[PDB]
Amino acid sequence: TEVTVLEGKTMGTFWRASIPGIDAKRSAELKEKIQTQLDADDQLLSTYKKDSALMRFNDSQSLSPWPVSEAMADIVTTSLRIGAKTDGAMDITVGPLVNLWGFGVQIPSQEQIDAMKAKTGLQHLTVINQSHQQYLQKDLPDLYVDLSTVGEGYAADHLARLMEQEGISRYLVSVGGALNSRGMNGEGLPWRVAIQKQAVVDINGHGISTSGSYRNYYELDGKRLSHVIDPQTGRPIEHNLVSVTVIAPTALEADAWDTGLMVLGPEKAKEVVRREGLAVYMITKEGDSFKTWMSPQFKSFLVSEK
Amino acid sequence: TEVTVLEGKTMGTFWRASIPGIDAKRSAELKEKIQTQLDADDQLLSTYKKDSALMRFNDSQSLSPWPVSEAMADIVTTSLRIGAKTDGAMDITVGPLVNLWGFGSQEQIDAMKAKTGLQHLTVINQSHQQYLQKDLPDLYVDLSTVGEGYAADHLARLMEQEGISRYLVSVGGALNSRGMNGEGLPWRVAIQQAVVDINGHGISTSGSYRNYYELDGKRLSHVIDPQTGRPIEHNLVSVTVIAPTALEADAWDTGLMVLGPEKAKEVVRREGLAVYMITKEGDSFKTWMSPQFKSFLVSE
Amino acid sequence: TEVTVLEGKTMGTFWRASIPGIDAKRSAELKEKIQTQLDADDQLLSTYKKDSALMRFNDSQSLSPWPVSEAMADIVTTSLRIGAKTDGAMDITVGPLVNLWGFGPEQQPVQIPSQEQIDAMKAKTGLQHLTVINQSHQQYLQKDLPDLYVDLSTVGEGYAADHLARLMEQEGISRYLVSVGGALNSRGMNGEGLPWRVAIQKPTVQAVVDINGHGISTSGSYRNYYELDGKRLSHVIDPQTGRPIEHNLVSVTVIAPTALEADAWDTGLMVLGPEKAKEVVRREGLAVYMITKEGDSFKTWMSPQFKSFLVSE
Amino acid sequence: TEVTVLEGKTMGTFWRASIPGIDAKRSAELKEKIQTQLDADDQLLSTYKKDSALMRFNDSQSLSPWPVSEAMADIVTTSLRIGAKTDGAMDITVGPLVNLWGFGPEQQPVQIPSQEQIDAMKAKTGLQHLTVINQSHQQYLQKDLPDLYVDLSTVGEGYAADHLARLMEQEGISRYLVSVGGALNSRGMNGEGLPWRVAIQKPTDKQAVVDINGHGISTSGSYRNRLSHVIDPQTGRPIEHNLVSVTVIAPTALEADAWDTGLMVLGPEKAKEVVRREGLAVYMITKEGDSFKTWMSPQFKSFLVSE
Ligand SMILES: [Ca+2]
Ligand SMILES: [Ca+2]
Ligand SMILES: [Ca+2]
Ligand SMILES: [Ca+2]
């Protein structure tokens, strides 16, 4: 009935873990184990750690097979495909363009943007899988891969795997915006998952991840300048889709989809969500108010009651 | 709330789907969509169809990248990875060795073994396409030991695309489930009288008490060890695996069955797998559960 | 156990379908199906859209057979019959007359009372001017007066509700309570084996009726709107008198084999008035409930056939 | 609680009315009213009575509109439409082809198998020859062929059952199970507050329950397994498929009785195409060799009893 909560820092954000029925000691051990695992995940994906596995790939100039871990190969493989399923809205090679703008301290880019698009593109990345090893291969020397739009999802899922190892079957795990829910909370009820305005959903056995455009676009005046850049135009998105929440089997998928959908905007997002049978929640600032939209698949998660 | 159940046949076996109460009309639609997908999956990897994706590849003598669906690449990728973590016990290239046994041979079987080997396959994943690639023309891939596992995971995702997030789906010896029952209770999945809650996971089982045999210490088995070309001979009667996906469960499943009690337990501990085994000692059987597996057990 | 209620707007009014518990996706697919069908009926009948099948016929001047759909033929067919059974009270061709008082919907209340040009207008009116022709693969409407104007607004809600129900059946749902405007249709029991709730206007325990296998429709409300000049002033116009009804009838509810029929009967019964209405009710042995305002009080009245539909639970 | 059961003869078959809480006096009066009404319907549609309304029309040679009742109008209209929707399988003008074989129940036949002369006979049949005209106080039937012969027996039973339903309403009776031949309409609860029991018998050679509260049902078959006496109005000869029984549930007994005969004629495959498209609730029984196989549509399933 008692719910122990563990929290800490990771990947420039925060992680949480709610585990029912744990003693002070095992709680201690688990925090140690959790922090250590996320630390290693940070060391894997972090773009700020010039020494991370990812940055080491980014720094190299090789065009031949580059050994990486199974996780890394899986993270990239799913990132590429969902990138392709979002007409390219979800691009893990868009870093150069985001840097040109100085988003996520600048001078609007003249026409360096066109020339910068040439050093971006999903089709430049390849994942090779073999029995005893996996590899990332780029056909562009200065291709730059950033995975901060999916790292939180991956971390949340990996965190689920840690619970299994530690023989824990009931838990509320989250890293930043991504969460995985399983089992009943303190009381014999599903963990409460509040989506942004606090409508609640029950994702027991599923994962969730939110994503949006907040740059003075979320309840603000002086309406101007979006920091989400469409990897197709090389420029700021213009539509009014401010928030996208996705529920899926894994938090990694949830995390890959929401970014891409966010980028595409309302119209296109809906076309993709319908075609893929995804459970999505959308907030758009049309009038001075915020209107919502929920695909059918997303409603079945709503907590019908109180 | 009610509880609807849909079933049929596919891949030379049976498929089932348990969904919270639904109406007859929607049942017929979901049933048709399910059967069509499973049919699609079978047309993809069945070795009995001369025109399945897998067979066209098997028939190709090309050593250059052969394009395949995302599913194909993913099934292969897991097979090769779990194939290594099990000392090659779980081999998807063993086909030419199993064939020369008529089960499911002179020491000349080393000939078929030559055209065998997990290191002969590579999977290439790109944004808009995937490819399989073999460095041996003769290489022959077979995914029967893993098909049900995938099919089951794929069915659960179809249910997901259909707005059904609460379910218990199964294909052959594999099951997949996420969500509670009509009541906020776990879908009852009984082990070979213990039950487990596999919410968010998959589960596969190999062999049964009705698939173990007599005549001396000789354990009669159809299961052929890839690193031998000959039938296994240990005392592992059955093995059940709970994993993140039924596809992985199905993979570890046959891998562990090939290895046997002792060797398998080694992997189970190393890989931290959720496993349940039954072995034959005297005239009785013993049960062994990894700690990880014990955590999924559900009483009341 | 639990009921799924879908809702929307159509024909300038509200529609509602109370169905037994359904998923989310399935529920979205249904509403989708329903709205489409309802939009299609609106485009079929609406006198408000100049592109509708009805308005096109009205705009035509030919006297030969004009091809229409099964629904059109059927709707006109039972409006002519119920029309004659009410002695012209239910007249789908009374349009030219109404347009003379600037009454009805919202013809911008500025049309003073007419003179006796209503006389020269009723000559553009007449149930005898319409014929319906049914064949195996096609149907037709036929008028013998070029300027005949057919208005199906008093019977449209009833047809929509019945068509909505036949759509529920096509979708495998045989238990439901469906409504469009003031017309309701139902058949099959609740999730609890009980009758779907259908309340009746309580002038001052409210009456409840089980309309299983039938359709129902009401005209008016005890929330009247007449008192100033001449006891009762209405916007409804007697098709045979060319003038606004002046009687005591506050509202009439009719239960019939279909919402369509029920919608035709109550309009015509509302026009006729209390006594004339009762004669036709007795003669056709209809299931009717009436509310009349006597003197600072409302009185209720039920035909024997109507009492038979009452649920005494 | 006590259910009174009334029965009698009509249209060469039998009708039954099960009604709860009714007393001796009322039942006696109802039995009179029912039989009186049925008689009139029989007098309206029978082709076995040379005096009936339908026969007067059949015997005439008129090409101009022929005045009939609303019921006659609606019956024909519904039959003509469902006739078209079943690809002419349900044909109310096929009577002369049937007689050619002498497969009319009241026919020997011991005739002589007709030769392809059946073609010169189909020419005297067809749903496109009939027209229904409705007006304020009148309705007409019009045929563009003298010798056209209309027969409404494959559908008169559904109309009688639905007509019986209206009768029940007139008398203030809300709970009943009323039937005429193989067509029934169910409404309300039985002796115990339970849905009237309606079963679908198996054998159709030579048993499930459904709750059709607020709906109607009719069954059609080809009882008598090798040579069928069901004539395909489009070929002029006996059907060849193995469908032997079709049960249809619909909002009205007329519709149900109209469809089941059409589907029966079409066969399993073509019938299922129709069931699917029209979203009909149907149950079919096919006999391969000596093995009976069944098939229900989704809409039918929802009427299956579950508890
Ligand atoms: Ca993201
Ligand atoms: Ca397996
Ligand atoms: Ca009306
Ligand atoms: Ca029939």
From Swiss-Prot, chain B:
Cofactor(s) named in the record: Mg(2+)
Binding-site residues, Mg(2+): T145, D250, D253, T254
Keyword Isomerase carried by entry: no
First-level EC class: transferase
Keywords associated with the record: Cell inner membrane, Cell membrane, FAD, Flavoprotein, Lipoprotein, Magnesium, Membrane, Metal-binding, Palmitate, Signal, Transferase
Domain of life according to the entry: Bacteria
Topology class, membrane: Lipid-anchor
Reaction equation(s) it catalyzes: L-threonyl-[protein] + FAD = FMN-L-threonyl-[protein] + AMP + H(+)
Residues binding FAD: M11, Y48, A89, M90, D91, D142, E148, I224
Subcellular location per the Swiss-Prot or TrEMBL entry: Cell inner membrane
Coarse class of the protein's main subcellular location: membrane
Role noted for this protein: Flavin transferase that catalyzes the transfer of the FMN moiety of FAD and its covalent binding to the hydroxyl group of a threonine residue in a target flavoprotein such as NqrB and NqrC, two subunits of the NQR complex.
NCBIfam families: PRK10461.1 (NF007774)
Family: Belongs to the ApbE family.
Subunit record text: Homodimer.
Protein name: FAD:protein FMN transferase
Organism name: Escherichia coli (strain K12)
Gene for this chain: apbE
